[PDB]
Amino acid sequence: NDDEDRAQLKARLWIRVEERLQQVLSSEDIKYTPRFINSLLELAYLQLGEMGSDLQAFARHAGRGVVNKSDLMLYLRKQPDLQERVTQ
Amino acid sequence: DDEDRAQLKARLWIRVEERLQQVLSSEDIKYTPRFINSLLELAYLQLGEMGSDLQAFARHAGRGVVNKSDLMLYLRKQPDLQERVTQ
Amino acid sequence: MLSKEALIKILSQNEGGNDMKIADEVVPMIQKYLDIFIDEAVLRSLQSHKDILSHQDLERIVGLLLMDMLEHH
Amino acid sequence: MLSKEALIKILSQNEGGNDMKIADEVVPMIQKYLDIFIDEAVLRSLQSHKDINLELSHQDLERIVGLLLMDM
């Protein structure tokens, strides 16, 4: 029941990654392999896990059971650029 | 306030030197002046990064005072250090 | 864009039982972080082959992406 | 061991008018962290100098500290 969830997650993530490749590229007919996108998908999945772990620890730190903007802002405290772009 | 950096580093060197001579079994192996300088700056800057994080974590929790949970959060990914630092 | 409840499950991948909860406000922000992260990964990958897209392209730029991203400056 | 006075001032280097406030039981935890930090730096620097190759520099430490820079 949980293996099916994981697989559909990685599948839907894979679709967003595809939608991102095609836009960002093009304008410059470019090559990319099924192994490249697969690796990117995996990396984006883990990266999301890493961040989620942090946000959860940050919400908990303040005694909340729900992740805040302030949690995201804290996670991105050393990244004023991401802080700006991610806002709207 | 570059004058404060020099005054505080001099203090830092006292313990740094103690530790250099310590695990050295009191004078056995040489250190260059560059190595001493680098270690000092590294110690001084890391303490500054951590303090800054400790303060942000305390403020995130709506406190004005840094407490144990802040340090533990800072050390979240190093369970061994968390223990060592309390023992 | 992507989903809203799928992000929750991916963000929670490392935690035990019940999924984490996220403010409606923060969902679009994580969505943007994701897109940026993918965009950065591709452009850096593409700049790596143009200098010097394979499994190797991504691998060459990966260490720096993570330092620069989720993290610092 | 690094006096509580210095430590608080060093931890506060990057901000504020007045220094940060730290609970009493946390100060000796940071003092110990500091002892560990410099002990790791040195002992790793020593080990690096042995792997590649009595006298340590710029370079034994540089080699041991990660992709952190804090300068350039």
Q: For residue A70, give the nearest of B60, B69, B76 by CB distance.
A: B60
Q: For residue A74, give the nearest of B56, B62, B69 by CB distance.
A: B56
DSSP D37-50: HHHHHHHHHHHHHH
Are D32 and B84 contacting, i.e. CB atoms less than 8 angstroms apart? yes
Cα radius of gyration rounded to whole Å, chain D: 16
Q: Do C1 and A16 make contact, defined as CB atoms within 8 angstroms?
A: yes
Residues with Cβ < 8 Å from C1, sequence gap 6 or more?
A16, C31
Q: For residue C47, what are its two tokens?
A: 């700049």
- C-alpha–C-alpha distance, residues B12 and C13, integer Å: 42
As beta bridge partners, residue D56 has B31
Query: Tokens 């709506």 label which residue?
Result: B62
Q: Do A61 and B73 make contact, defined as CB atoms within 8 angstroms?
A: yes
Task: Give ∠ CA A73-A67-B60 in degrees, rounded to 5.
Answer: 50
Annotated domain spans of chain B: 1-87
Residues with Cβ < 8 Å from A44, sequence gap 6 or more?
A13, A17, C34, C37, C38, C41
Q: How far is CA A42 from CA A35, C38, C55, C57, in A?
A: 11, 11, 12, 15
Resolution in A: 2.4
Q: Under the phi-then-psi rule, with left for phi > 0, alpha for psi from -120 to 50, and beta for the rest, what region is B15?
A: alpha
Picking from A3, A16, A45, A73 by the largest number of C CB atoms within 10 A of its own CB, the best residue to mutate is A16
Annotated domain spans of chain C: 2-73
Task: Give ∠ CA D10-D13-D19 in degrees, rounded to 5.
Answer: 80
DSSP B30-74: EE-HHHHHHHHHHHHHHHHHHHHHHHHHHHHTT-SEE-HHHHHHH
D27 at interface of B, judged by CB pairs closer than 8 A:
no
Give me the architecture of the A1-88 domain, per CATH. Answer: Orthogonal Bundle (1.10)
Nearest to C21 by CA among A66, A57, A62, A52: A66
Q: Which residues of A touch C11 (CB under 8 A)?
A: 48-49, 51-52, 55-56
A1 at interface of C, judged by CB pairs closer than 8 A:
no
Residues with Cβ < 8 Å from C43, sequence gap 6 or more?
A24
- C-alpha–C-alpha distance, residues D19 and A63, integer Å: 26
CA atoms in the 13 A half-sphere facing the CB of D17: 0
Picking from A61, A71, A78 by the largest number of B CB atoms within 10 A of its own CB, the best residue to mutate is A61
Query: Tokens 């406190």 label which residue?
Result: B63
Q: For residue C32, what are its two tokens?
A: 């943007």
Q: At what angle do helices B79-86 and D27-51 cross, to 10 degrees?
A: 120
Q: For residue A43, what are its two tokens?
A: 């990396």
Which chain C residue's Cα is nearest to A8?
A: C6
* N residues, chain D: 72
B71 at interface of D, judged by CB pairs closer than 8 A:
yes
D29 at interface of B, judged by CB pairs closer than 8 A:
yes
Superfamily for the B1-87 domain: Histone, subunit A (1.10.20.10)
- C-alpha–C-alpha distance, residues B79 and B83, integer Å: 6
Q: For residue D10, give the nearest of B12, B42, B65 by CB distance.
A: B12
Query: Tokens 């040489």 label which residue?
Result: B30
Give me the architecture of the C2-73 domain, per CATH. Answer: Orthogonal Bundle (1.10)
Picking from C9, C42, C65 by the largest number of A CB atoms within 10 A of its own CB, the best residue to mutate is C42
- C-alpha–C-alpha distance, residues D28 and D25, integer Å: 6
Q: C touches which chains (3+ CB pairs under 8 A)?
A: A
- C-alpha–C-alpha distance, residues D4 and D22, integer Å: 10
| Topology given in CATH for the domain delimited by D2-71 | Histone, subunit A (1.10.20)
Technique of determination: X-ray
